[PDB]
């Protein structure tokens, strides 16, 4: 299938193929850095911002061949949204309706419904 | 002064000493507990730490020596000197004498007890 | 002070002294040990319900000789109430009875 796909793409020629691609592809969803997670270790607790993986994983989770890969992606996304939803509580939230996560709602929710 | 010099003599000479002689050497040593001089009790505890490390591994004299040394260490584990208390705690709380595993730490420290501490 | 105090106490005669001590006023304030705390380690995190210390830690922090003791007790009490009110962020009467217990103590202190 992929072979025939690239065959088509080359057949169409560049003047057609460039139609594959201004918000200019990104906005860096959160103006802040959050969704932190300290990975556990016997000696240290390095912190990880899970949010950085959202734009990628979503595209993987929403769009993917490799049923195995897509299933892994969607399961992992389910885990992260569970974690983030739990992190919604215990937050000081006196600046916005949902300061620690408001834009992430906007990004996720359409993807959640599609999935 | 004589106390200190005697204890320093003892500390220098212990590695060559035989356990059998060391037994009746230490038997009149142990009385410097409760002696009102931090120098004396600290040299005491130095000697006892050496014994404990060198006898936690036989010769029944050596066995009783080790038991007595541990006992007097426990005795020292109460002091009028907070500094002595701290240093002997560090000795005891150290991993070799208190296993790193918290389970094993607790299990080992269970043995350490006197009906005076 | 304490020597003279006990001397006076015995001087009174026990028929007065027994007035030192009904509903008996101990019911394990909260039915739930809602003061869960897993102590750190390198292998495990055993959980402690600091609830049991509450009355004790209050009374000693409320009244005690040995200013060192009282200061340590009240500092630890500050820390623990600090923690629990931090723990108030939890599932939605959380420490309602606990608040009833503690607030008068807090204000007197």
The structure tokens listed for B80 are: 């009028």
* Interface residue A25 vs chain C (CB under 8 A): no
How many angstroms is the resolution?
4.5
DSSP conformation class of B115: T
* Helix (H), strand (E), coil (C) string for C9-46: HHHHCHHHHHHHCCCCCCCCCCCCCCCCCECCCCCCCC
CA count, 13 A, side-chain hemisphere, C108: 10
CA count, 13 A, side-chain hemisphere, B111: 11
Instruction: Name the closest residue on chain C to residue A90, using Cα atoms.
Output: C89
DSSP conformation class of C47: B
Strand boundaries in A1-115, DSSP class E:
36-38, 47-49
Binding partners of B (≥3 Cβ pairs within 8 A): C
Binding partners of A (≥3 Cβ pairs within 8 A): C
* Interface residue C89 vs chain A (CB under 8 A): yes
CA distances from residue C42 to A14, A68, B109 in whole angstroms, order as listed:
60, 36, 18
Residues of B whose CB is below 8 A from C45: none
User: What is the number of other CB atoms lying within 10 angstroms of the CB of residue B45?
Assistant: 21
Tallying the residues shown for chain B, one arrives at 117
CA distance B75 to A49: 53
Q: How many helices (H) and strands (E) does chain A have?
A: 5, 2
CA distance C18 to B109: 42
Name residues 26-65 of chain C within 8 A of A (Cβ).
42
Give, in degrees to the nearest 5, the angle at Cα B5 between B1 and B9.
Answer: 170
CA distances from residue A56 to A64, A70, C71 in whole angstroms, order as listed:
11, 12, 54
8 Å CB contact between C58 and C73? no
Method used experimentally: cryo-EM
Q: Which of C51, C6, C9 is nearest to C30 (CA)?
A: C51
Task: Return the bridge partners of C47, or none.
Answer: C38
CA distance A27 to A73: 23
Judged by phi (left if over 0) then psi (alpha if -120 to 50, else beta), residue C66 lies in left
| Torsion from C-alpha of B96, B102, B107, B110, nearest 10 degrees | 90
* Helix (H), strand (E), coil (C) string for B17-68: CCHHHHHHHHCCCHHHCCCCCHHHHHHHHHHHHHHHHHHCCCCHHHHHHHHH
8 Å CB contact between C88 and C94? yes
8 Å CB contact between B3 and B40? yes
Spacing of C-alpha C32 from chain mean position: 17
Name residues 82-101 of chain B within 8 A of C (Cβ).
100-101
| Torsion from C-alpha of B65, B67, B69, B75, nearest 10 degrees | -150
The structure tokens listed for A27 are: 């906005």
* Interface residue A89 vs chain C (CB under 8 A): yes
Residues of C whose CB is below 8 A from B102: 41-44
Tallying the residues shown for chain C, one arrives at 109
Residues of A whose CB is below 8 A from C89: 89-90
User: What is the number of other CB atoms lying within 10 angstroms of the CB of residue C49?
Assistant: 14
Q: Best residue in B102, B103, B107 to probe C by mutation, most C CBs within 10 Å? A: B102
Residues of C whose CB is below 8 A from B101: 43
Distance (Å) from the C-alpha of residue C2 to the closest C-alpha of chain A? 49
CA distances from residue B65 to A97, B19, B59 in whole angstroms, order as listed:
72, 8, 10
Q: Is A114 helix (H, G, I), strand (E, B) or coil?
A: helix
The structure tokens listed for A83 are: 């974690």
Examine chains B and C and say if they touch (3+ CB pairs below 8 A).
Answer: yes
8 Å CB contact between A60 and A69? yes
Burial B51-75 (b: 16+ CB within 10 A, else e): bbebbeeeeeebeebbebbbebbbb
Tallying the residues shown for chain A, one arrives at 115
Q: Strands A47-49 and A36-38, how do they pair?
A: antiparallel
Examine chains B and A and say if they touch (3+ CB pairs below 8 A).
Answer: no
CA distance C90 to C70: 31
Spacing of C-alpha B72 from chain mean position: 6
């Amino acid at each position: 299938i992929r072979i025939r796909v690239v065959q088509m793409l080359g057949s169409l020629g560049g003047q057609i193929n460039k139609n594959l691609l201004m918000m200019k592809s990104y906005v860096a969803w959160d103006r802040e850095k959050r969704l932190s997670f300290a990975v556990p270790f016997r000696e240290m607790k390095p912190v990880i911002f899970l949010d950085v993986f959202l734009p990628r994983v979503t595209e993987l989770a929403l769009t993917a061949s490799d049923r195995q890969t897509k299933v892994a992606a969607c399961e992992l996304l389910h885990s992260m949204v569970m974690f983030m939803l739990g992190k919604a509580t215990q937050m000081p939230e006196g600046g916005q309706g949902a300061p620690p996560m408001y834009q992430l709602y906007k990004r996720t929710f359409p993807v959640l419904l599609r999935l | 002064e004589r106390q200190k010099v005697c204890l320093d003599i003892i500390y220098k000479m212990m590695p060559k000493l035989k356990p059998v002689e060391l037994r009746e050497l230490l038997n009149p040593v142990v009385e410097f507990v409760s002696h009102p001089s931090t120098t004396c009790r600290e040299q005491m505890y130095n000697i006892l730490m050496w014994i404990h490390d060198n006898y936690r591994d036989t010769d029944n004299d050596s066995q009783e020596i080790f038991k007595l040394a541990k006992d007097v260490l426990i005795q020292g584990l109460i002091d009028e000197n907070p500094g002595l208390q701290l240093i002997i705690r560090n000795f005891w709380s150290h991993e070799t004498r208190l296993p790193s595993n918290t389970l094993d730490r607790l299990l080992a420290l269970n043995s350490l007890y006197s009906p005076k501490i």
